[PDB]
């Protein structure tokens, strides 16, 4: 029982931003991907992830205050373990989930099995690595993007074995004239 | 009361309140029920009106079938009926159909002193803003509105609401 | 054994409360309480328990007019059954006037997932305290409020359902009861 | 001849109110109930009593400044006495007039008969017991409510034997946009 | 009308009470109460009501372990019936671990006699407060005491018995409830 | 409702006492006599009244601290009034109840009737008139003695119309070696 | 505890506790039940023993039918039985019948440190004084006691009890 | 290997005691109950538990200095786990072992199984909750009482799977005159 933070080795390389009113900070937590049913290799791009933009929609400026990736195993993992790869990279990175371990910072976690415990692994996004702005007057390519991958499950089933959510907080600024 | 300085943002909004022509119309529009307004107040736990007015827009169809609408803002409490709008203080009566003039865009303001500007708090207030509008049975209905009423304004949101996503 | 206190990611957002006139105040008592919220293992159980409606709590709250929570925590308790018959539980303390079906707990900010049994040291009791600044402490007053605390929990239909629960959640805490109401006797 | 104040044993338990312009204070005095024709058990709730609201109607805020229950016997009572029960309780109280004496404060008065005098009994409402606000931006349940009861008269007639009025003063605030 | 408070001749004789360790004390509430003690007019009624056994009082006392009286008074209430059908009542606040049948109230030190109805201004309500230094204030504690308050009242079989009482006695007061007991829920 | 003290005109003439340990003061209240069944003329002598001595028995010294005569009418008196005479005199007094009004201090009270109220009359014993000691190493003749009388009731019945009790407090001293 | 200075008086007393000869006797005399003691503690609400002893008096009949009695004081709590008196600390064994000598009047004291001296308070104490006495079945019973046990002492009374008379 | 203290949520509510010599403090440790053979629901009342009184017997005063409940699993539990409930409540509590979890403080422990370790769980008795005196000049109802319960074992056997002992220290005062 409990959770554990496992930082991703990072190096300074923040995104450039606009020169530059009232702001509001909202929390969020959607699920990036699920494991267990088939070989899954996801590329979640915070900038365009639906759940995030549903909050973004009404604004012109939205920047990440904090953000972390939450890896969570389920009972199914105890009997049928699995291995997951994780990397927080800028959208520009030509790196594909199938090659996370070849990226500076890329981690590998083993979920399940009778040997281990069912801890919740948290891998925060180092904001000095990548662009904080998810929506601005210009679109940056530096945007934060989560890379995750796991080999096709030894015993596939429509009941997930592990899932990773992305929670955090966004600061919404300059209101956007939208329909409704 | 009002509100302090802790994290707060003001968003604009405008939705359609009611329409006329198709048949006799007597509406009782209540913000704090207005689906449009809520899709905005959904993420927060504290909403507060800052500005709000009702807009009366006739369509060209109006000239052929001139109507005549009544508008009036009143707290939800007010025992006033659409049928008694002109007997209320804010009560207005526009003609529409290109024989009724009333400045670029016909609009009747809220007031705020008249009502409670909450819409969403820890308690459900009773005296929130409500729009009363009546327009009698039209001769030669049409299925295609001859005029409508929009409600535009600005809401102040705070205290983020835990949500799904 | 062991007891593990796992706090829920939270955001300051207290519920507003009516004020008391500066007249002479009413005395006050503080009673403790702890009841069963739900049970897992028999069937897919996805419950929403609202402290407002909470029968056990209000049996204590009955005689008074003004009642506010002091402290509250959700207690997740696995049973020997869960050892060889694991399950995953979702928990979330929500404001009550909030959407969010227990099926969506992993999509709610605080949202947590725990594995009971199966994996090592999974027999521990989990504890998720209710941040009283997350919601509204008032459970009884001149007006009933909208942001009262509500606990969300979900699991999944077991693959080996049994008549005896494999885990449960209790809610314990302490209320501040005041302003006693005039009654028969 | 004359009148007498008979306080009702009360304990501190005021109503909660809203945080929070010009105000006006108006006096009022309507009659709550009448005795003599048949067993009467009234539950006057200041919040919704017609006479009171006729004054309330044009406003958004109305709070009780002072308020008392006035019990008054009539000549009919001299020949055919009666017993009346009185309790000032908050609207929430699950107490019914038939059980006033089982309520802390509940009084019993004997009106009439050759033995006594025909005094007017006054039982004021302790404002620290109950909610003062009769009309506000929210509706409170704490509202003041008068409980009164008397057994069916030994000799019924359409001429009342005793009646109880409720007089007081209300402070009207924030004007309500009404029709007319 | 009128209310007449007629105090009972009394002698200082407080009941000893157990002491509380100087550890941290329990919070405390103070609830009011008022129930019917007896009824006169139907038949010779000679009752002894002990606040200890008092059902209405202990329904309030139930959830707590330590309960003590703050104030208490006996209320004698005549009814219209008593106007043309007088009666005499006897009242006495006794320590409970005291002999004295209500038939002997006029032989007990404090002992009083009142005439309800018949004579002028006899429709008044009589009030006989309970001197809390006369008896023992404790009604619930680590031990049940012997000098707990007890009310004595007597009348006499009426000469014109009726199904509806001609007078009654209520007991109103306020208790100090503390040390809440651990229970189911 | 209520009680009234009616002092008896007295003149200084206390009893002589012995020159002269721990003492205890006990309260008492027995009933001296009853009225209504027949013409009653009682002569209660505090010194030998049974109830008093039941308390006296175990001691050698017992003196009156305070003492009063309590006259109490009953409903029966309302319909069938009566007149009672009262005098507190020393046991030596050659005065008989039939002649109380011819004694300085002797009072007359009218109990009952539709005219009056049913008050409880209290006539205290002036300790400076009479001997305080009820039991001492010598027996005094000065002892306090209550004289009461009432004419035979207009309508006799075995249900008393009025009764007079004697309450007070005694100080018991020097313990007496008694059997048991 | 003990007692302060507020109105208090000390009265003496002596009553018969038990008798022997008629048949086997095994008594368990409890003050605070002893009718004699109570006729004294009846008027008060607080009684307290100051002095107390048990007296053993044989009658001339004893010489003809010498017996042998056991005495012992113990708190009411003590699981001791009359039959086990000599196994108790205070335990005594007198012969009686003019062949047993033990000073003018055979008497066995209380102690007070051994028991609680209350008998009557706001609470009913459990460890109050109790007399244990046993004397086996006598050969040739007699309906006329051969010896008895008296209990004399002094009680401190306070807090007058409301009574009838 | 090792032991772990798991405090029971408690609230201030100590027992009342007598006003009030030499004292001695003795340690003790008996076993309250055993699990494994059948559904067991025990109600150990420190005041009357035999082992405790064997020490109490010779005295008039005995108060708890400290006291804890010791839960200990045995090898049998590894293969056939079980769940135990524990509550320290005053003897007055109308709570039965079958409903411990519905009592503020009531804990639940899972002993055995391949998943966990075989730790010894200790749950001390909060002396401010309950009466400290186990034997006094008056008998209190506030006495400490242990509530424990476990469902009927999946695989019953006469060899215990877990047992709970109660150790502590008592202060014995005023000697009691006993036989022997």
From Swiss-Prot, chains B, G:
Keywords linked to the UniProt accession: Capsid protein, T=3 icosahedral capsid protein, Virion
Principal location listed in the UniProt entry: virion
GO MF annotation: an example: structural molecule activity
A GO CC annotation given for this chain: T=3 icosahedral viral capsid
Disulfide bonds: none
Protein location: Virion
Pfam families associated with the record: Tymo_coat
Taxonomy, superkingdom: Viruses
Record-linked InterPro entries: Tymo_coat, Viral_coat
Family designation: Belongs to the tymoviruses capsid protein family.
Task performed by this protein: Self-assembles to form a T=3 icosahedral capsid composed of 180 copies of the capsid protein. The capsid encapsulates the single-stranded RNA genome.
This protein's name: Capsid protein
Higher taxonomy: Viruses, Riboviria, Orthornavirae, Kitrinoviricota, Alsuviricetes
